[PDB]
Amino acid sequence: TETSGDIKLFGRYPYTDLEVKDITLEKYINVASKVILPHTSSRLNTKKFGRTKIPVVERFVNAMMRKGRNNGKKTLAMRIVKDAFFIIEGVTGQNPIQILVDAICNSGPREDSARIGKGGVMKRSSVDVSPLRRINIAIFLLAKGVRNSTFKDIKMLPEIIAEELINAAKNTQSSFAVKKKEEIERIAKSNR
C-alpha cells in the first residue's frame, strides 16, 4: 500500500545509522534485526542469553502488558506505542529510536545495595551491577513511571509515554525513572 522500498519500523522510521553511545552496554541492545512490526514468536526465552537478542521495541511493548487485567493484550500495546512514536518523532525531531536508546542509557543505576555477610549477620554494602541487569532495570523504571502516572488523570496514555521518554533521554530531573536512579545510587553510596 504505502511503500515498496526497504524495511522501516511501522513502515515509517529509518532503521539505520544507530549508535548505542555507552560501550558498557553495546553487546546487549539489539538495534540490528529489521522487523516491520514489533511482534515475534521466536522462542529465545528457553536459552542462556536469548532474552538479550529480542529486538528493542519488542522488549518495550512487553513491559506494557501489566497491572493484571491487561495480561496477554499485545495488540493493545502495539497500538499504544505506535501513537507515542508519532508524538515523540514530532516533538523531538529525531528518529523515535534514538530517544528510546538514550532513555535506557541514562535510566539504569550503576551501583546498588546488597547483603554480603555470609558467616554471621547479613550486613548491607554497595555492589556493582552487570551490563545486563543495568538495562533490565531501566525498562522496569520507565514502565512503572508511566503506568502509575496515568491511573486517575484525564490525559491520554500515549501522550504520557512521550512526556517521560523525551525527558529521560535528556537526563532531566523531570523523569520519574531518572529521579529513582539517583535515589538508588545515593543509598548505595551511603552504605559504601
Partner: peptide, 8 residues
C-alpha cells in the same frame, strides 16, 4: 577484587 551482582 570486587563483588558484582548482575549476570557477568
Amino acid at each position: 577484587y570486587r563483588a558484582i551482582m548482575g549476570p557477568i
